[PDB]
């Protein structure tokens, strides 16, 4: 069904995450974590305090697809176990901010060809696939995008619902 999913997404905020590579999304899927540049870390922390759910929707650059979506379960925090992210030519690990804990809602991919009817008002009504890392996606667009993903029957949203407060 889709009823618990719709409940989790009700009044949520949504952010597009553009990963440079598949490895970092693989790490995020395995460890339930994400880290971003301080400019986006501050925005995500503000949103986490401000909304019942904050959803990250992931896309690996040049893949032509989204790789899934997840809900923040914490603000960013430092001092945890290190994560060996793959970072660009000349960027150090301390350039990233703290670590956000995330609960995956869907680990399956969605090709951009299937979201071509969805535009994001907060990015000039461009197709939702278009945007910089951290671009916020307006509520209706983000909800419809998340509902397009194939169902992930490995997921149980019961425990996610209990975290909402």
Ligand X SMILES: CNC(=O)c1n[nH]c2c1CCC2
Residues of the binding site: 18-20, 34-35, 85, 133
Q: What is the distance between the alpha carbons of residues 114 and 133, in angstroms, rounded to a whole number? A: 20
Binding-site member from 58, 66, 69, 85 for ligand X (CB under 6 A)? 85
- Residue 35 interacts with ligand X (CB under 6 A): yes or no: yes
Round to whole Å and give the CA distance between 83 and 27: 8
CA 47 – CA 56 distance, rounded (Å): 11
Residue identified by tokens 């299937």 is 114
Choose between 9 and 41: whose C-beta lies nearer to ligand X.
41
- Binding test (CB under 6 A) with ligand X, winner from 8, 13, 14, 36: 36
Residues 131-160 binding ligand X (CB under 6 A) are 133
Stretch that binds ligand X, among 8-16, 19-27, 43-51, 59-67 (CB under 6 A): 19-27
For 75, other C-beta atoms within 10 Å of its C-beta total: 17
Binding of ligand X by 76 (CB under 6 A): no
Task: Indicate whether 120 belongs to the interface with ligand X (CB under 6 A).
Answer: no
**Which of 4, 43, 52, 87 is close enough to bind ligand X by CB under 6 A?**
87
Q: Which of 24, 59, 76, 143 binds ligand X (CB under 6 A)?
A: 24
| Residue 124: Cβ-neighbour burial (10 angstroms; 0-12, 13-18, 19+) | exposed
Q: How much is the CA Rg of the chain, to the nearest whole Å?
A: 15
Q: Residue 123, interface with ligand X (CB under 6 A)?
A: no
The answer for residues whose C-beta is within 8 angstroms of residue 58's C-beta and 6 or more apart is 17, 19, 25, 28, 66, 67, 68, 69, 70
Q: Is there binding between residue 37 and ligand X (CB under 6 A)?
A: yes
Q: Which two tokens stand for residue 98?
A: 């703290």
Q: Footprint of ligand X on this chain (CB under 6 A)?
A: 19-20, 24, 35-37, 85, 87-88, 91, 96, 133
């Amino acid at each position: 069904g889709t009823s618990k999913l719709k409940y989790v997404l009700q009044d949520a905020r949504f952010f597009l995450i553009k990963s440079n590579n598949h490895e970092n999304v693989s790490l995020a899927k395995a460890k339930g974590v994400w880290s971003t540049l301080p400019v986006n870390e501050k925005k995500l922390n503000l949103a986490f305090r401000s909304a019942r759910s904050v959803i990250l929707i992931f896309s690996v650059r040049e893949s032509g697809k989204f790789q899934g979506f997840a809900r923040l379960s914490s603000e960013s925090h430092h001092g945890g176990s290190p994560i060996h992210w793959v970072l660009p030519a000349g960027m150090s690990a301390k350039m990233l901010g703290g670590v956000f804990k995330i609960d995956w809602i869907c680990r399956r991919e969605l090709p951009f060809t299937k979201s071509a009817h969805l535009t994001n008002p907060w990015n000039e009504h461009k197709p939702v696939k278009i945007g910089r890392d951290g671009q916020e996606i307006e509520l209706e667009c983000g909800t419809q995008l998340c509902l397009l993903f194939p169902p992930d029957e490995s997921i149980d949203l019961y425990q996610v619902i209990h975290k909402m407060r």
